[PDB]
Ligand binder design. Structure first.
Ligand SMILES: OC[C@H]1O[C@@H](O)[C@H](O)[C@@H](O)[C@@H]1O
Length: 398
């Protein structure tokens, strides 16, 4: 009788779990039976592999955390229809509650039916800094990479780890994409990671992106290989390191440890020309056996798109609402800056999808790029060799 749903996600511990708790509590308040299927692994690559295996085994969960064109790629597998939550989306008028771009991402049947619910917009192009460390070292928050490298050299010379970073493929790629946006610009990022333009992927602007990647390598510590993103954030909160380049799920950790922007830590975008790299956490609802699981799915979709839910969920998560009509008044200064910058970058053509977090590219392309980025980062590869390999690896993945 009760609505039921197995939910596959990678929100394991910390600020991620705290925010997810908001959803779990609302689902149980409507007598929903939550069947937890967590797959631990920053950024979701591991969940994506376990998710693919579940669907190949004809064991699809009722709901899965998923990104962008992976939604449409599963739809093309034929495993999502019928679109029982589009009935929810039409009655509630989702096309009037979401940007046209986010609405596109959520839709199946060649854009005809909603099949996924969005809960948020994360931003990738952020730098987090320990305020006491920067004040202690007479360092202004940098606004260019030249200013960042100079601040990093000064901190390094004072015995301080400048950049807390975990070297895992997706995590290298997260920094890489923020760097690319600033070194090359909005049109460059679009051409490379949205168009997959070969001349751009292997060109001299991409060489300069790998140039800066090589500099950032020198600013990380010996414990970086395989370190979890949230450990890196932890070292910034404890003042073991000065900076972290990471999306604003890092803010979920700062909040969960009772630190405030301005007073305890500084948040500033990575350099860009009115750029913004967006990331929408969303849940797809698969074809499933059982009327209780269909009602579970429609109940999750509705809850996930609620006005008050997206206010409370996102205060904990670190992101901003996907819903357009949610009051930002209660959010902190970093989230209000995110929402402001999103509006500005949208009007300037700088509002671009993160590829490291699944909005720009299907998983085959995302993986090809990550693999080249992490090999450059963890070796002594030249920048030009990396750009050649990047363009070849994208081309071969097509
Ligand atoms: O795992 C770290 C982060 O990975 C991203 O891809 C997800 O969109 C976030 O919700 C998550 O907190």
């Amino acid at each position: 009788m009760a609505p039921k749903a197995e939910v596959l996600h990678w929100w394991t511990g910390g600020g991620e779990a705290k925010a997810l708790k908001v959803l779990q509590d609302e689902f149980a308040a409507q007598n929903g039976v939550w069947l937890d299927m967590p797959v631990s692994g920053g950024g979701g690559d591991a969940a994506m592999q376990t998710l693919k295996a579940r669907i190949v085994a004809n064991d699809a969960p009722a709901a899965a955390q998923i990104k962008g064109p992976t939604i449409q790629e599963y739809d093309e597998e034929g495993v999502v229809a019928p679109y029982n939550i589009d009935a929810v989306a039409k009655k509630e008028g989702w096309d009037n509650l979401l940007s046209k771009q986010v609405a596109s991402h959520m839709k199946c049947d060649d854009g005809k039916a909603y099949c996924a619910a969005p809960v948020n917009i994360h931003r990738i192009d952020w730098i987090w800094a320990n305020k006491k460390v920067l004040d202690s070292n007479g360092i202004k928050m940098p606004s260019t990479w030249a200013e960042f490298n100079a601040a990093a050299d000064k901190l390094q010379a004072n015995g301080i780890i400048p950049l807390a970073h975990g070297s895992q493929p997706w995590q290298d790629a997260t920094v890489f994409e923020a760097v690319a946006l600033g070194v090359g610009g909005n049109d460059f990022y679009r051409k490379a990671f949205v168009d997959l333009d070969a001349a751009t992927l292997g060109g001299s602007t991409m060489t300069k992106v790998f140039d800066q990647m090589r500099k950032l390598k020198g600013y990380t510590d010996a414990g970086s290989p395989g370190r979890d993103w949230n450990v890196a954030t932890g070292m910034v909160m404890e003042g073991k390191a000065a900076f972290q380049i990471m999306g604003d799920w890092a803010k979920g950790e700062f909040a969960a440890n009772n630190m405030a922007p301005g007073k305890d830590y500084i948040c500033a975008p990575t350099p860009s020309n009115n750029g913004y790299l967006y990331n929408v956490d969303s849940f797809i609802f698969y074809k499933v056996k059982g009327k209780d699981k269909v009602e579970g799915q429609k109940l999750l979709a509705s809850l996930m798109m609620g006005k008050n839910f997206q206010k409370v969920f996102n205060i904990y998560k670190g992101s901003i609402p996907a819903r357009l009509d949610v009051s930002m008044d209660e959010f902190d200064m970093c989230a209000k800056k995110s929402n402001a910058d999103l509006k500005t970058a949208g009007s300037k053509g700088g509002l671009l999808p993160s590829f490291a977090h699944g909005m720009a590219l299907r998983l085959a392309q995302k993986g090809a790029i990550q693999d080249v980025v992490t090999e450059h980062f963890n070796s002594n590869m030249s920048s030009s060799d990396a750009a050649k390999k990047l363009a070849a690896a994208v081309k071969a993945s097509l």
